[PDB]
Homo-oligomer: A and B are copies of this chain.
Amino acid sequence: GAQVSSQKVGAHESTINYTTINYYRDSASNAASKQDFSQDPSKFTEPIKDVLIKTAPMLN
């Protein structure tokens, strides 16, 4: 059941990996993976009904 993932190596001394085994039945007991996703800011930065083209007049 071992999970093996790569570290993003900052200061250096191939790919370095690290190993994770979950010891408990409840996902709540688990550490945080920090394997997270980014998303586009659009829902807050561009919430307009008509798609904005930045080279064009915002008002036409």
Residue numbers of A with Cβ under 8 A of B are 1-2, 4-5, 7-11, 13, 16-19, 21-28, 30, 32-36
Contact = CB atoms under 8 A, between A and B. Distances in A.
A22 B16 contact: yes
Contacts of A4: 1
Contacts of A22: 7, 16-19
How many copies are assembled?
Answer: 3
A5 B1 CA distance: 8
Contacts of A26: 7
Contact of A1 (B8, B17, B30, B34): B17
A20 to B, nearest CB: 9
Contact of A16 (B16, B23, B27, B34): B27
